Amino acid sequence: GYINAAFRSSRNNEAYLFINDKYVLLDYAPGTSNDKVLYGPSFVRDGYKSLAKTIFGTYGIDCSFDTEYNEAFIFYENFCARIDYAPHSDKDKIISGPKKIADMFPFFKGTVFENGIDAAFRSTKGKEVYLFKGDKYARIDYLTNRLVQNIKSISDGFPCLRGTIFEAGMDSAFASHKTNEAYLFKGEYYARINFTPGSTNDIMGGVKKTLDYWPSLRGIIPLE
Amino acid sequence: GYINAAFRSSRNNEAYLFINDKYVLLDYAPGTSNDKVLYGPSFVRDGYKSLAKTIFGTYGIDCSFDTEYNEAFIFYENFCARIDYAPHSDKDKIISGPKKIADMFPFFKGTVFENGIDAAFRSTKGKEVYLFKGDKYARIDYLTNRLVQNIKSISDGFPCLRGTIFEAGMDSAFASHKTNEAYLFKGEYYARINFTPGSTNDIMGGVKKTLDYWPSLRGIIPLE
Numbered sequence: 001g002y003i004n005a006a007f008r009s010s011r012n013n014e015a016y017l018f019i020n021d022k023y024v025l026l027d028y029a030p031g032t033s034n035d036k037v038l039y040g041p042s043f044v045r046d047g048y049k050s051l052a053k054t055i056f057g058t059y060g061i062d063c064s065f066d067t068e069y070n071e072a073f074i075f076y077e078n079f080c081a082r083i084d085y086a087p088h089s090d091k092d093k094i095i096s097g098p099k100k101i102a103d104m105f106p107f108f109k110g111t112v113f114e115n116g117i118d119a120a121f122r123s124t125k126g127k128e129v130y131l132f133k134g135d136k137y138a139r140i141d142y143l144t145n146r147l148v149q150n151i152k153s154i155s156d157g158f159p160c161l162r163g164t165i166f167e168a169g170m171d172s173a174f175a176s177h178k179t180n181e182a183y184l185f186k187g188e189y190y191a192r193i194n195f196t197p198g199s200t201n202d203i204m205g206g207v208k209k210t211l212d213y214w215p216s217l218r219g220i221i222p223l224e
Numbered sequence: 225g226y227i228n229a230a231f232r233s234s235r236n237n238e239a240y241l242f243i244n245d246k247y248v249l250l251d252y253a254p255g256t257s258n259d260k261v262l263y264g265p266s267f268v269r270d271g272y273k274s275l276a277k278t279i280f281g282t283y284g285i286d287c288s289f290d291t292e293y294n295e296a297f298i299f300y301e302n303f304c305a306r307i308d309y310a311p312h313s314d315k316d317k318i319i320s321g322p323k324k325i326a327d328m329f330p331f332f333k334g335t336v337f338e339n340g341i342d343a344a345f346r347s348t349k350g351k352e353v354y355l356f357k358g359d360k361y362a363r364i365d366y367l368t369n370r371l372v373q374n375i376k377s378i379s380d381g382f383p384c385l386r387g388t389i390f391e392a393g394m395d396s397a398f399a400s401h402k403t404n405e406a407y408l409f410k411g412e413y414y415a416r417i418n419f420t421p422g423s424t425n426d427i428m429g430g431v432k433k434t435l436d437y438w439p440s441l442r443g444i445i446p447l448e
């Protein structure tokens with residue numbers, strides 16, 4: 001019962017975190033010690049009416065990423081959908097789907113990504129997204145629907161992760177509102193990384209405990 | 225692109241037929257030659273607003289069976305839902321699901337039925353339903369959620385099918401409004417069978433052409 005998916009909100013310093021078939025809306029306070037749970041924990045089916053009678057409403061969300069405006073891709077196993085998550089309102093809706101991953105992203109056919117994605121986060125560069133499955137990552141443009149480069153080992157693109165628990169996989173991720181930062185999650189741990197698109201960079205550099213960084217999540221995770 | 229699923233309506237002499245991602249409502253006229261298409265062929269997503277943004281709306285329905293009143297179980301691969309099909313209105317709605325088959329029917333766990341069902345029809349007896357997968361069939365009570373007997377070969381329970389194309393499997397079925405009769409489909413073929421719950425039969429009619437029996441379907445089956 002840890003964080004299985006996440007996406008950055010269009011609202012400043014807010015992110016949606018999905019755990020089992022539930023979620024929380026968090027003010028994650030990147031520059032301040034005043035993190036706070038703004039909504040939830042709530043069942044996906046209760047919080048998102050448009051998702052109530054779907055596989056997402058039944059089983060929850062296991063990967064997602066912000067795109068632009070108020071729209072996000074959400075996943076469950078081999079299925080995905082594009083949604084308007086309509087922050088702080090009643091107005092959520094499915095724009096596209098649900099569709100099999102292979103039908104939404106045909107370049108994934110014949111790869112390990114066609115059966116499910118572990119984690120994803122929105123790049124600062126153009127319409128780019130990083131997606132993770134096992135020890136591999138992919139880099140796509142969601143607007144033109146194109147694989148930007150060959151699928152590579154996580155360690156090829158993020159050398160800073162060699163020798164950490166993230167080397168063989170990530171459970172969940174979201175991009176920060178602070179430029180070129182992102183959070184990676186696995187079990188009780190997170191890392192805050194700094195990245196530069198297209199450059200084999202580094203930093204960092206600190207695998208810590210999620211509950212130390214967000215005390216407002218005490219008693220919410222782990223969810224037994 | 226032949227019939228992939230069907231269910232008997234609560235309305236006398238009407239059946240819903242599912243083909244690719246579409247359906248047809250048919251007056252199947254079991255006692256006369258006045259068969260007609262009443263509605264469709266239309267997309268499932270257009271005709272059932274409640275299914276529009278679900279896996280059933282994207283990909284169609286590959287198995288189903290009438291329960292009672294205006295409720296039907298519908299399937300797509302390993303998922304299923306309980307729906308009110310609200311005949312001749314737009315008051316359709318999902319009552320339960322979508323859920324995985326193992327979660328809805330726990331007794332199917334470990335069986336060949338776990339990952340999808342080929343075809344099904346409602347019995348005249350109590351709340352019993354016959355379900356088909358490959359050369360095997362199952363008989364369940366949907367109320368008590370119970371397997372009524374061991375999973376068996378189609379030939380054992382339906383000896384009239386021996387030596388015919390239906391021996392190895394069926395694509396679709398529905399129970400007739402005429403008691404103890406049902407229609408089974410595969411490719412361009414159908415059989416009309418008499419069945420006696422809990423007891424084998426003898427001879428009935430033989431494998432025939434669906435288009436000969438329902439000329440109102442010419443130009444519709446197969447869907448090119």
Ligand SMILES: [Ca+2]
Nearest residue numbers: 004062118171
């Ligand atoms: Ca995940």
Ligand SMILES: [Ca+2]
Nearest residue numbers: 228286342395
């Ligand atoms: Ca079928």
Ligand SMILES: [Cl-]
Nearest residue numbers: 006064120173
């Ligand atoms: Cl994620």
Ligand SMILES: [Cl-]
Nearest residue numbers: 230288344397
């Ligand atoms: Cl069927």
Ligand SMILES: [Cl-]
Nearest residue numbers: 054055278279
């Ligand atoms: Cl769905």
Ligand code: NA
Nearest residue numbers: 006064120173
């Ligand atoms: Na994410």
Ligand code: NA
Nearest residue numbers: 230288344397
């Ligand atoms: Na059926």
